[PDB]
Amino acid sequence: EDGFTAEHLAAEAMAADMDPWLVFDARTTPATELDAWLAKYPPSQVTRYGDPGSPNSEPVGWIAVYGQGYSPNSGDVQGLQAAWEALQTSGRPITPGTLRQLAITHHVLSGKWLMHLAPGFKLDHAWAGIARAVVEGRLQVAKVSPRAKEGGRQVICVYTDDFTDRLGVLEADSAIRAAGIKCLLTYKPDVYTYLGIYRANRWHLCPTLYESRFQGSRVLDRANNVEL
Numbered sequence: 001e002d003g004f005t006a007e008h009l010a011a012e013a014m015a016a017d018m019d020p021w022l023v024f025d026a027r028t029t030p031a032t033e034l035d036a037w038l039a040k041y042p043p044s045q046v047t048r049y050g051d052p053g054s055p056n057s058e059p060v061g062w063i064a065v066y067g068q069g070y071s072p073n074s075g076d077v078q079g080l081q082a083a084w085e086a087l088q089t090s091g092r093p094i095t096p097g098t099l100r101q102l103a104i105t106h107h108v109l110s111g112k113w114l115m116h117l118a119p120g121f122k123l124d125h126a127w128a129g130i131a132r133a134v135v136e137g138r139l140q141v142a143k144v145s146p147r148a149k150e151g152g153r154q155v156i157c158v159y160t161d162d163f164t165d166r167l168g169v170l171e172a173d174s175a176i177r178a179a180g181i182k183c184l185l186t187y188k189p190d191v192y193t194y195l196g197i198y199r200a201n202r203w204h205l206c207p208t209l210y211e212s213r214f215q216g217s218r219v220l221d222r223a224n225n226v227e228l
Contacts, residue, residue: 019061022046022146024131026067031135034065038128043154044119046146056146063127064143065134073161075108077194084195094203096223103191104164111163111189111209113172115181116153122183123154129179130156138175163189166228169210170219177217185212 003012024037041055043063050058083102087094103109117123127144134142145155160172173185187210197207210228212219219228 017061019059021061021143022056022063024065024135026065026135026137027069034131034135038131042124043127043144043146044124048146048148051149054146060146062143062145064141065131066141067134067137067139070141073110074190075103075110076106077108080106080108080191081195094205096205096209099191099195099205100164100223103189108190108194109164110159110161111169111187111192113158113160113169113176113185113187113212115156115158115176115183115185117156117183118153119147119151123156126179126181126183127156130158130176130181133175133179139172158185163187163209166210166221170228173212173217173219177214182214184214186210187212 003009022041024034041063045054046056046060046063047054048059050056050060080102083105084099087098087102092098115126117126123144130139130142130144133139139158140161141159143155143157147154158172158176160168162168169187176185186208188207189209192207192209197203197205199207201207206222208222210219211222220226221228
């Protein structure tokens with residue numbers, strides 16, 4: 001009856017985000033609808049809380065598009081979320097090198113290319129384009145956060161499965177650029193966000209792995225400072 005209490009079960013049900021998600025699934029839904037979908041639910045319009053005048057009268061966690069195939073695999077955070085603990089509680093040397101090996105020691109290989117665009121055409125046209133890619137099969141999944149009351153360049157994260165593979169990372173970078181995105185891209189592996197690697201890190205570990213600037217595309221390795 002313990003955790004079965006109202007107070008306990010209440011805190012036990014809390015999650016990062018409890019709001020629904022605006023999703024276009026290529027699996028269940030072909031590529032003849034995306035068109036109206038993109039026009040029916042733009043990120044500059046779709047609001048985080050479902051504000052009046054929005055295509056959503058209710059909070060929307062994300063705006064997501066899934067292509068043909070998207071195993072919900074996060075690897076095996078279990079052991080990983082244990083190995084990280086065993087290391088810290090040892091004074092062991094924590095470096096981008098040990099975390100890299102960590103993600104490999106648990107087959108949790110997937111990261112995300114992030115970018116933040118100013119609300120409006122840049123975001124809407126970039127996202128639209130990006131979501132026009134997904135449905136075709138060149139990317140696995142991509143999302144874009146809805147506007148937030150006091151504006152602010154919203155988010156657009158692109159996903160690839162296997163960061164250790166710079167080649168697969170670049171093809172995604174390639175797709176993003178082909179969509180005409182001139183913004184800066186920064187790749188962040190799930191291990192980082194998972195094992196909690198904020199920006200005010202006391203362990204001098206950057207939350208970014210790779211970066212990319214328009215030209216063309218200048219892709220860097222912020223780990224050993226090397227140009228791909």
